[PDB]
Amino acid sequence: FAAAXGLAAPQXPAPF
Secondary structure (H helix, E strand, O other), X not given: OOOHHHHOXXXXXXXX
């Protein structure tokens, strides 16, 4: 959804 705790924050995983 247009908010998903930072619509990208919990996905950063990749970089670390």
